[PDB]
Amino acid sequence: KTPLAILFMAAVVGTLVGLAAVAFDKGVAWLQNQRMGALVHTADNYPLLLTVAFLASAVLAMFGYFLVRKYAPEAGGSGIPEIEGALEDQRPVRWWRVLPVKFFGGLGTLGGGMVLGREGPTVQIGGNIGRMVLDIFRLKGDEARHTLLATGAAAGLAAAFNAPLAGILFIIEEMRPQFRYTLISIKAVFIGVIMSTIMYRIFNHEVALIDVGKLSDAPLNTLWLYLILGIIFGIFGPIFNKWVLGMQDLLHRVHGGNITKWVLMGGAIGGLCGLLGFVAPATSGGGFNLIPIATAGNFSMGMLVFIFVARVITTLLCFSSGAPGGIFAPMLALGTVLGTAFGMVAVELFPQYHLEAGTFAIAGMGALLAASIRAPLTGIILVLEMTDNYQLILPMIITGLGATLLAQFTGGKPLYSAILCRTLAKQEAEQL
Amino acid sequence: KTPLAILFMAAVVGTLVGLAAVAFDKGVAWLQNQRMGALVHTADNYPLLLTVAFLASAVLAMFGYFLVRKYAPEAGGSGIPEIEGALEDQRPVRWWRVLPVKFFGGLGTLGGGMVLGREGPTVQIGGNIGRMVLDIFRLKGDEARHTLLATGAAAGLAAAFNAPLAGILFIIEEMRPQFRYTLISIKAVFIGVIMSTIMYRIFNHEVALIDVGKLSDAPLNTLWLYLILGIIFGIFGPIFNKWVLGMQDLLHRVHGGNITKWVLMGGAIGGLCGLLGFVAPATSGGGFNLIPIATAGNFSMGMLVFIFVARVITTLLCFSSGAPGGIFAPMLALGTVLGTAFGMVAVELFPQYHLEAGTFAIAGMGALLAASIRAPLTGIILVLEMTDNYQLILPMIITGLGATLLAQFTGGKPLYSAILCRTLAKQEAEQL
Ligand SMILES: [Cl-]
Ligand SMILES: [Cl-]
């Protein structure tokens, strides 16, 4: 009955996921530029600059926590576990509530300077837009419910990163298990991902979303050092996931689910990350402003160690508090400062290999998206599409598959699966 | 064990496809810039230069017509109606026989300035490489055979056009019908296609395969003219399909299968394309040269009529003779010439629209792929991502989905489906 109307509506999904995505990116960039642009006006007084860097980030984050805790308490956090749990018919898709809250409260949170990603809002906005097109064009059956939820979600990562290949390979490796799939479902997801990057590339004509320049090569007597980098990253992956879920119920003890104490904790958390945008800008922000600085070596090793310790204690504070933001971009810059700190000691230990710390940074950039969030194939092609260094593929397979092999040996679920089974275990804690 | 094995070999075949397609593209460009590098070296005798432009491209074509007729007769033509019949278990995949002569016979056919594409001898080289690494690794299953044959075929377009989105979308519209598809079959197709653009973007760092230079945006009040462009292409497409298969019948009358009369006819055809690649370079060649010159508005209206009738003669003279080469790039250069002629008779008839002949050439470029091959979604994502004009997506849909409306209404089969059902008619002719 529906051979081609589901493929027309998938292009309608992919058009809106790519128009509501680049309006989100232009809204967090307009808010970031006029929050840093509000500090150059009061540059004469130093304590007045710190006040309006705290308060302009606090009331932007308090605007984001209030919209989540009052109107849609599922837009908090990433939103990828809420779409991953909606494709299994376990979580509801309330697009009339999450779409004005993940957009406008996700702006205020990300444009306020919190250490959170563009991809968490965009994947959940895309999952709700695909339900919105499904509801305003009333389609029957679960055959169209889940193929319009798969697109939008896959079209969201395709517009949050300009990654059409990594957007489809995300939902293959994360949300859809080993079964048999209709070719119309595969066709409709492709039209939505294609329409998502087209609406990105209409309004964003730049290549190299992470622009580092074309770096050195990795010779084959060097590729064993990227296997050591997978051992370091594959151990930290499950350790970081214990810290994410360990602070989700540690910051939950500050409040008790009280909305007036959640937004006052999120305004102190959001105001601290706007305070750390003028004092030390390398320890806050979404992370994408740090990846090209850390790749082509500008830091020391004492500063690069300090950046890593200060960024893990702000990635945890931003994500686990219940703010509408992603976790890829805080962890892409977290694997870049760890790959550079590994790359800076590999130059000194092995001067006969003619090494470069930037090749270990681009290799280790998607090695935390392989160990912590166990999607190694998605994390490799994402870094290759963002950072156009395609000659660094054989170090990326060595460090991306050696990370996800030891992430299973040490014992670790994916992060979006571990968050989802902690929200499914609590929605069944009221329904006895 | 079993499923992770064929995912590893997908990266093996896609690396091998993307390296054999780069070596094919660099080898065709080496043979082209050696007979045209020795072109100005004979700038003292113009009748003798017309002889060493004929004969240097004739014996290059005679090497390509003899490798096909002696060794692998299933390597003559495109090769897309030999992998798409191989996925239906009707044609054999002789990777020890086709893969040498689709490479070395294609270096002399395409390097001799003939009107053929690289997408023909890279899909059949691609699908044979996936069968090549099925027998050297000794795999047993039949769907594990089909997911390695479709992996390299989809990696063939992705390393010929640098279009991974069009490589996946081509084996859904044209090569595979609707079924229940295993997830690792979809995953292994994705791995070989991303690994071939990785191998293509290591060597070729071009941001666009065709550079026309940011043509204008088409307003909504001008958007009805792309419907007439698809109406015109949707009629000519079925007419061009009967000319491909009619010149196939007409040229199989100089020779009844005779290998001496095949390669002497193929050397006169291939020597003429080296002859009319010096005195009139826009009538022969593969076609990727005059696409930036057509959309720039260089040719006049009486010249574009001369270019169209001469390129539609040398496309049927070359493809329907039996030469190992594709027909996409001759038909992208046939829709660009017909699209420029439409945009130049509409920029004078409608001065109120402030039109441009380039927006009708880019839109009309993939309107003959939607009419002859009848793969509309592939041809839209082929023209853009080769020409970075994503702001013409709404023109390209109307001359896209809308040129397949009159392609079916006129009574036109797809081209590769019409060659395959004609090849399989000769297959069951002698044996039955
Ligand atoms: Cl979350
Ligand atoms: Cl996320």
Ligand SMILES: [Cl-]
């Ligand atoms: Cl053919």
Ligand SMILES: [Cl-]
């Ligand atoms: Cl072809």
